[PDB]
Amino acid sequence: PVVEKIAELGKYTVGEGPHWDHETQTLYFVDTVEKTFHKYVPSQKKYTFCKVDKLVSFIIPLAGSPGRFVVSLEREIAILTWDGVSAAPTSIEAIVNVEPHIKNNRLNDGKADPLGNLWTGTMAIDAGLPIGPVTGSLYHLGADKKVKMHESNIAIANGLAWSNDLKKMYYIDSGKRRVDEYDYDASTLSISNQRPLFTFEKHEVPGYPDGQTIDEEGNLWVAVFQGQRIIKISTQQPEVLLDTVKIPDPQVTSVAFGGPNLDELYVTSAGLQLDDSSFDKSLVNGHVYRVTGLGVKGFAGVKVKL
Ligand SMILES: [Hg+2]
Ligand SMILES: [Hg+2]
Ligand SMILES: [Mg+2]
């Protein structure tokens, strides 16, 4: 595979939450510390950003409403109306605060399931690795604007994906250094039967699982924070490492398939230099990467239905 730095995009403190909108051929993503949203149109080499004053962790187009996006603002799920180019949104409409009385929590990774339901989890703002406060939970937001809790005791609420047949959900609590698998009931939106799918310890994989996505063959692609890589793992059989793609940035954060043929893998990373790093500062930059020649296709980003 070929890994290219996207020079036009610069460096991000914690680049995160990549989302590919296939209809407009546009990549959206966030910087979860700098309180900014980002838009990249590769075919036209257009880049824009948008500033808010709360911590953000995802940005997903709202189904049926061009120019509107479902985003996180600390603990609030909100709709931002944004023209895609001005440095500030036009308007902000709060939907729900998922944890109004837990003042030191924030939302982290979030994604729509294939039915358009937003799933997202929380974490302590001062969550730590390998050890720190464990205060997070996993939620989904129904079309009735009520949240349901699905999992608790989450340290660092991170990557989500669903199997192509809607029978499984994959989930990452970075603190656990593993990818979990759940049975997923699409009709009731309930998850059960949590079991480890892939355990980093067992495969001498360094670092922490962060974001993830799934390809058309049902394989998971997992971003490895402080591992300088993405890994390809099987969902058909537990504990099978299929492939490793090295990324120059050590703090790989997340992944999304994109491009006209959905066969380009966009990779975000973090330039934020941490205390206990296994990598010298000069290596930690926070670029965005494009990976091609993986030989698989993924799926377009799902919009949130409300
Ligand atoms: Hg924006
Ligand atoms: Hg925005
Ligand atoms: Mg993440």
Residue numbers in the entry: 3 to 308
Show passages lifted from the paper.
Here, selenomethionine derivatization and mercury soaking have been investigated for SFX experiments using the high-energy XFEL at the SPring-8 Angstrom Compact Free-Electron Laser (SACLA), Hyogo, Japan. Three successful cases are reported of single-wavelength anomalous diffraction (SAD) phasing using X-rays of less than 1 Å wavelength with reasonable numbers of diffraction patterns (13 000, 60 000 and 11 000). We succeeded in experimental phasing using SeMet-derivatization and Hg-soaking techniques at wavelengths of 0.954 and 0.984 Å, respectively. Such high-energy X-rays, which are essential for Se-SAD, allowed us to collect data at high resolution (1.4–1.6 Å) and perform SAD phasing with 11 000–60 000 indexed patterns.
In our earlier study using CrystFEL Version 0.5.3a, we found that SAD phasing of Hg-derivative microcrystals of LRE at a wavelength of 0.984 Å (12.6 keV) was not successful. Because data processing methods have improved significantly since that time, we reprocessed the raw data using state-of-the-art methods. The localization of the Hg site required 11 000 patterns. The electron-density map from 11 000 patterns was readily interpretable. In the anomalous difference Fourier map, two Hg atoms with peak heights of 30.4σ and 7.1σ were identified near the cysteine residue with occupancies of 0.65 and 0.14, respectively. The refined structure was consistent with the structure solved by SIRAS phasing (root-mean-square deviation of the main-chain atoms of 0.15 Å). In SAD phasing, the phase improvement technique is essential, where high-resolution reflections play an important role, while low-resolution reflections contain a larger anomalous signal that enables substructure determination. To investigate how the high-resolution cutoff affected the phasing, we collected an additional data set for LRE-Hg.
